[PDB]
Structure formats: C-alpha cells, structure tokens
Structure 1
Amino acid sequence: AEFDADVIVDARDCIMGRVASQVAEQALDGETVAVVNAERAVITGREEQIVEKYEKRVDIGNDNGYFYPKRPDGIFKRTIRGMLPHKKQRGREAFESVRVYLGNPYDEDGEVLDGTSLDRLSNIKFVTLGEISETLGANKTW
C-alpha cells in the first residue's frame, strides 16, 4: 500500500530476466522500483521444459526448507533477489526498495525498459508468468 517508486516498470510482454537485471542494477543505485503486471511478464522457451524447472523448485525442500513462490508475484521478486547480494546490508536495502505487483495499482502506466520487450508477432515459443503460476497450482487472483 503506497510505495513512492522513483520508477514504475511495466513487465507486460517483457523478458523477466532482462527486466530483473535492470531493476536490480537500479535498486543498487538507490532507486525505488515497482514492477507492474507481473502476471503478464514472459520468458522464452519450450513451455514444457520451463514448467518442469519451476515445478522442480516447488518440490525441492526439507525441514530446513526451500520456500519457492508459485504466484507470478513472488516468482518475479525471487528472480530479482537472485541478482542482488540480498544478505549484505546494501543488498537487502536495494531488494527491500523493490516491489512487484499483480496488475497495476498505480495511476501512471509504467514505462517499458529498453531491450526487454518481446514481439509476439515474431515469437511463438514463450510463456506467461501467470500461465506458469496456474500450472504450479496458484490461485488465479488476477
């Protein structure tokens, strides 16, 4: 609720990894970022294999635990955390100044970062984070 984001990024039809890499770099530069429409973010590849990887991550675990997100919400956030030294003071600060959202709770329409957009007209092998979450068992709350 209420997040003074210095930047609002729209993930719709963008390559999650390429967005994250840039959101990571900016948060470490002191920027407060908000990723919007996570559910509509995309990742290239053969859906069958992609899903296997994420399903494996869900299954992995033990008493110590391996909490892996299923909602496109966290999936995206965990992706970013993997690009930050989240256990260091600086890293945790940067990570905590970044939040991912389902849809867009803001008024402004986020901006699209360069080199992160995927042309649906010249690409058929890719998937939606939302599709992944539905496969994982998430509750489509979007």
Structure 2
Amino acid sequence: AEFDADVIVDARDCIMGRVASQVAEQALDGETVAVVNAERAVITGREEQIVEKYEKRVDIGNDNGYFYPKRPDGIFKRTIRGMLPHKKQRGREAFESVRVYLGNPYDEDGEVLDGTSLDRLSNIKFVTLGEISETLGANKTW
C-alpha cells in the first residue's frame, strides 16, 4: 500500500543471498528498499538438495513454534532478516524499511545490483524461488 523506497532492486536472475546481503547493508545505512520480482530470484546448486533443506525448515517446529515461510515473498524476507540484528532497535528499524514483492508493483523498473547477476547461459545448476515455493506447497499466486 504505497512504499516510498529510495531503492528498488530487481531480483530476477539474481543470487538471493548476494542481493540480501546488500539490501541489509543499505537498510542499515538508512535506505528504504523494495526488492521486486522475488519469485524470479535464484539460488545456485542442486535443486534436490536445496529443496530438501527448505523442506526441513518447514517440517521443524513444536508448540513454541518455528514458523518458516513458503512463499518466495517470505523466503526472501526471512533471508534478509537473518542478515539483520532484527531484535535490536536499529536492526528492527532497518528490517522494517525493507519489503519484498511478487512481480513488480511499481512503475519504475528495479535496478540490478552489481555482483548479484546470474548468467543462465553459463549455469544449469540453480533453482528459482518460485519453483522452490511450488515444491513446498505454496499456492502459486504469482
């Protein structure tokens, strides 16, 4: 519902962890960031082992709770939270000025951050957040 982001990042074909690491760095520097097209973000490796790891996080839990996200939306945001001291004041502030979106709700196009791009012509072993979500059982709403 309207988010004045000083920066709009395009995660399409970009390595999730590398984008996350930079969006965290910027958020702590006071930048308001909006990550777009999360469903198209990418994570390298063997799809079978990658999914096994995210499936384990989904199965973990108990009464106290280990609510782990399934949508690429939340997967990505949780990824960023893990790079922020979200329990400290400055950390929660940073984290709260960062939002992730399925598709691109803005008119502008996001920018591709240097060092985070993946070349599909040079890589066959990688997966898509969207693919991971579908496997996890998420309702492909994107």
TM-score by length of 1: 1.00
Please report how far the alpha carbon of residue 55 of structure 1 lies from its aligned counterpart in structure 2 after TM superposition. 0.1
The runs of at least 4 consecutive aligned structure 1 residues that moved more than 4 Å come to: none
Q: Secondary structure at the match of 2:48?
A: helix
Identity score, percent: 100
1:107-133 deviation per Cα after TM superposition (whole angstroms, max 9, x unaligned): 000000000000000000000000000
1:70-124 deviation per Cα after TM superposition (whole angstroms, max 9, x unaligned): 0000000000000000000000000000000000000000000000000000000
Distance 1:122 1:41 in 2: 16
Q: Secondary structure at the match of 2:99?
A: strand
2:48 maps to 1:48: yes
1:2-47 deviation per Cα after TM superposition (whole angstroms, max 9, x unaligned): 0000000000000000000000000000000000000000000000
Unaligned regions of 5+ residues in structure 1, if any?
none
Distance 2:48 2:16 in 1: 18
Please report how far the alpha carbon of residue 135 of structure 1 lies from its aligned counterpart in structure 2 after TM superposition. 0.1
TM-score by length of 2: 1.00
Distance 2:79 2:127 in 1: 16
Q: Secondary structure at the match of 2:52?
A: helix
Q: Secondary structure at the match of 1:106?
A: coil
Counting matched residue pairs gives 142
Unaligned regions of 5+ residues in structure 2, if any?
none
* Superposition CA RMSD, Å: 0.2
Q: Secondary structure at the match of 1:57?
A: helix
